[PDB]
Design a protein around this ligand. Structure first.
Ligand SMILES: [Zn+2]
Lengths: 190, 13, 213, 178
């Protein structure tokens, strides 16, 4: 087999945006074998060694004045630029959650039923999922998946309520998400 | 509308 | 005639660049007028909502007189309220594609110390820079741009191009860099009659120049 | 509020590199180094934006040469293998004979080299499969997603088999619809 040692070099140019493009930070990072050696951070305004191995590079690059000028202008020509180019399909991407309620295929809690609210296929990741019993929110006996990234520009989340279903009861899962003006609701009747 | 990359730089020798 | 007039009016004639002129507050809703000494200049526009705020006030003017030498001085737009300046001039950050090859530009030759600046001022400066460096409109004064040839109507290497003003938090807009109108400056400079002002710190330029056979 | 990362790597002796853009954890695009072209994560992205692929290839050339500089400067210190965590899940609830997609999520590993196989009932499956490139993490390890469209049935058993140097044996991760 091939058990030869490996050597890895990673580069990351990161544009961090706060309040749209109002405040921007560019962080350029060099990473050797998973350890960052040198970086340019726009809040500092020059290269700085992160480990002793990147010290020659900070010193070299800091002496190139055209290079530092380009990197300082890069918060506009690169970060704010790319933000703008992709805005419509990234920042403003809105995909509506598909919401279902189902009782669990397991009911392992004797007469305590488990109700699942599945919220799938949505973008962006900001979401609120609330369970109601007879129009009153249920906070206790709730268990969650948290946010799941599918890797295809959609999220999903599953929120499970334990309850003892009594007849007449109306259970409601309520989803609020940026893709919708008013809450999405799915009703389940005991 | 065109994506812009940052140039990777040659290390100190 | 559009070719010689585009070249000349943008790149050969001195632009107007005056600070602290006081508009005369005359009836017209399409014109501002200021003393410049012994003569007066008139800035024409088609944007009363904008211009009404500049009437009677201390303004800074910058752009191109569309009448040229020997006539009275008239221009389009180019006005901003005086008295609001940055600590030092801001080099406008620029992405430029030349025939499709990208580079970043940062130069005092395209810069402003105005908190609020006209799209015209920036676009004039850009164009004078591109002419000097890439001989965009032909027959420049620098001899640079030798390598792009002379095939276009301009006797240059380019006959296509746009400047996009890529604004941070307003809708972006672009001007055609090789537009001639009906051929005379009073026609192709009319793009500037809106007196479009931008926050000088809150944008960058994405500029393309090329040649279509 | 938002983060856009342009992330590249070069790896020796495998002599493999990648160039991608990430928006808030999702891939915008990568460059196909073989075909010299921009590949959008969702095709519709390509209708609204462009990227000049050759710029990725130029950056990779510099990355390759720099890796060689660092390999020597460090006195040939190699990477420590970090094994992947593997998760199999679906993208939405599973309904009998309603098309769905199995996700094999590979996480927290380095170096970026893996061999991933989907198996249905012991047998390898390739129909309709796809995968992401190696995606960044803030700890500089990698993520990757593999996908298998499938028709849910009670009788099928799937495995996502993952091979990585950090692992003591190939990782087989089971999934069935019950
Ligand atoms: Zn831009």
């Amino acid at each position: 087999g091939d058990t030869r040692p490996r050597f890895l070099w990673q580069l990351k140019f990161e544009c961090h945006f706060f309040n749209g493009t109002e405040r921007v930070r560019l962080l350029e990072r060099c990473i050797y074998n998973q350890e960052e050696s040198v970086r340019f951070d726009s809040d500092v305004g020059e290269y700085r060694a992160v480990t002793e191995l990147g010290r020659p590079d900070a010193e070299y690059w800091n002496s190139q004045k055209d290079l530092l000028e380009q990197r300082r202008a890069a918060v506009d020509t690169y970060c704010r630029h790319n933000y703008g180019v992709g805005e419509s399909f990234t920042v403003q991407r809105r995909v509506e959650p598909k919401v279902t309620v189902y009782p669990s295929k397991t009911q392992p809690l004797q007469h305590h039923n488990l109700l699942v609210c599945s919220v799938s296929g949505f973008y962006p990741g900001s979401i609120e999922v609330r369970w109601f019993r007879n129009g009153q929110e249920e906070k206790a006996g709730v268990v969650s998946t948290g946010l799941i990234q599918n890797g295809d520009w959609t999220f999903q989340t599953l929120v499970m309520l334990e309850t003892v279903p009594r007849s007449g009861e109306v259970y409601t899962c309520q989803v609020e998400h940026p893709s919708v003006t008013s809450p999405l609701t799915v009703e389940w009747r005991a | 509308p065109k994506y812009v990359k940052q140039n990777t730089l040659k290390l100190a020798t | 005639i559009g070719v010689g007039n585009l070249r000349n009016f943008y790149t050969k004639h001195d632009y107007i660049d005056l600070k602290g002129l006081i508009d005369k507050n005359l009836p017209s809703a399409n014109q501002l007028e200021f003393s410049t000494g012994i003569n007066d200049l008139i800035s024409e526009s088609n944007n009363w909502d904008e211009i009404s705020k500049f009437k009677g006030k201390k303004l800074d003017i910058f752009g191109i007189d569309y009448n040229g030498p020997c006539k009275s001085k008239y221009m389009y737009g180019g006005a901003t309220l005086s008295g609001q300046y940055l600590n030092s001039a801001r080099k406008i950050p620029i992405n430029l594609w030349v025939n499709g090859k990208h580079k970043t530009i940062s130069t005092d030759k395209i810069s402003t110390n105005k908190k609020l600046v006209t799209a015209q001022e920036i676009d004039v400066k850009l164009r004078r820079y591109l002419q000097e460096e890439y001989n965009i409109y032909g027959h420049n004064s620098t001899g640079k741009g030798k390598e792009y040839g002379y095939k276009s109507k301009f006797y240059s290497g380019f006959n296509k191009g746009k400047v996009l003003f890529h604004l941070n938090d307003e809708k972006s807009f672009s001007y055609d860099l090789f537009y001639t109108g009906d051929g005379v400056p009073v026609s192709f400079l009319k793009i500037y009659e809106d007196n479009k002002i931008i926050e000088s710190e809150k944008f960058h330029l994405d500029v393309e120049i090329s040649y279509v056979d | 509020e938002h983060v856009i990362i342009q992330a590249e790597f070069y790896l020796n002796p495998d002599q493999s590199g990648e160039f991608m853009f990430d928006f808030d954890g999702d891939e915008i695009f990568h460059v196909d180094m073989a075909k010299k072209e921009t590949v959008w994560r969702l095709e519709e992205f390509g209708r609204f934006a462009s990227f000049e692929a050759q710029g990725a290839l130029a950056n990779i050339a510099v990355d390759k040469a720099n890796l060689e500089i660092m390999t020597k400067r460090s006195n040939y210190t190699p990477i420590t293998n970090v094994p992947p965590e593997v998760t199999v899940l679906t993208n939405s609830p599973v309904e009998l004979r309603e098309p769905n997609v199995l996700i094999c999520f590979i996480d927290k590993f380095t170096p970026p080299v893996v061999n991933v196989t989907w198996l249905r009932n012991g047998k390898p499956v390739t129909t309709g499969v796809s995968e992401t490139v190696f995606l960044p993490r803030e700890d500089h390890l990698f993520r990757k997603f593999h996908y298998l469209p499938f028709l849910p049935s009670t009788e099928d058993v799937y495995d996502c088999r993952v091979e990585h140097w950090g692992l003591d044996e190939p990782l087989l991760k089971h999934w069935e619809f019950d």
